């Protein structure tokens, strides 16, 4: 049994999003609470609403969420969360979660199942693709059997970007740092990889889904 959220992305303030949660590999002979929980950047978990999956379709809302948010069971495997009058205060990762109903006290009465979450970014800014710059040690440096190379991924909106190295051939010894958001609202991050120095090129592959862009940068040893 698993959950997966979708429908997240950038939106302008005042805008409206509808998230859906897909349940897979579930037991139809049992009833559950399906819940939405969000988490603002660097902040704690915040419960939004739950709905029971029986014929009643009864729902339970956080006080602050009454009015702007609407949960509903739209199928035997799908629950949706409607969000209106969005503010940047609503920028968060949105999780779908499931837990058991009370039964006879014999159940897992907590949220035992969680989706990976979907990112919602409320911003007036238009989506913007990152610029990508190679990071190599200074030319004056003594060569070694190994070298650490990198890519700087600068000035994009919104999260996320994905960074791979040599299309996934290089995975060990990669460090991709958490993004930092500038006061402009744009994001930047860096990624580095340590390699055995060789004739084979080292290339970072940077994707930004929100702008449907994909860029490769081959990092010269700077030698």
């Amino acid at each position: 049994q698993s959950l997966e959220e979708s429908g997240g992305g950038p939106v302008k303030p005042g805008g409206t999003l509808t998230l859906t949660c897909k349940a897979s590999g579930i037991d139809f002979s049992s009833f559950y609470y399906m819940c939405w929980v969000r988490q603002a950047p660097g902040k704690g978990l915040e419960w939004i609403a739950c709905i029971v999956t029986d014929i009643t379709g009864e729902s339970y809302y956080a006080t602050w969420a009454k009015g702007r948010f609407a949960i509903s069971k739209t199928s035997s495997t799908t629950v949706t969360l409607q969000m209106t009058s969005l503010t940047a205060a609503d920028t968060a990762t949105y999780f779908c979660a499931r837990g058991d109903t009370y039964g006879y006290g014999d159940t897992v009465y907590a949220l035992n199942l969680w989706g990976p979450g979907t990112l919602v970014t409320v911003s007036s800014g238009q989506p913007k693709a990152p610029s990508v710059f190679p990071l190599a040690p200074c030319c004056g440096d003594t060569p070694s059997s190994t070298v650490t190379l990198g890519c700087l991924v600068k000035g994009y909106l919104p999260e996320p970007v994905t960074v791979t190295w040599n299309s996934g051939t290089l995975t060990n010894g990669v460090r991709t740092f958490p993004s930092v958001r500038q006061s402009s609202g744009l994001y930047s991050l860096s990624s580095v990889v340590s390699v055995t120095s060789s004739s084979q090129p080292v290339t970072c592959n940077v994707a930004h889904p929100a702008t449907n862009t994909k860029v490769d940068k081959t990092v010269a040893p700077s030698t």
Partner: protein, 216 residues
Amino acid sequence: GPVLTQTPPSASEPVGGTVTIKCQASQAIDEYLGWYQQKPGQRPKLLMYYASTLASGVPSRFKGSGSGTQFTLTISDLECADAATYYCQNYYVGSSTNYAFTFGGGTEVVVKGDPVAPTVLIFPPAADQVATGTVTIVCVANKYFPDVTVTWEVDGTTQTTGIENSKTPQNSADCTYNLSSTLTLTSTQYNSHKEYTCKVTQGTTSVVQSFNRGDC
């Protein structure tokens, strides 16, 4: 419904050690209380429900207790892999007018390994960034514990603006961090100075890496 207050806001304990963290409810909630683990960049994981019942697959070195308004989670034999934020939650439906699903504010748990000084790398901006009118100098501090502070110098002058730092989660095997520090300058500023220095300090230890723009 009830407000859940977690303490401490952050705890740091050594590998192999034992930590007890607290969750307090503003009104009685019987044992309708769950505990969750959330590692940076990951989804929450249920550890404990009905205050003291272990979730499936969770080791008995996690132990929950309490009822009414005062609850505890105790983690023993701490591993670097246990570094995470831990949340409590009221989970309860009595009726359409009596329910609660609210979380506590979370407790961050840092797991302390042996101290190790970082190795430090510095990366001058590439020619094509210089062409844009803005450059970013990147400094990376690898595999270190405990936390560092970063200072930047340009021709000996300490930088007071343009610096951004980003720290990775604790390594699941050895508890260490990695850090990227960047210094952003105009291309004019960059081309007007010679020596660029990243200094990474842990108490009475510092590791310093530099380059000279003329040499790149």
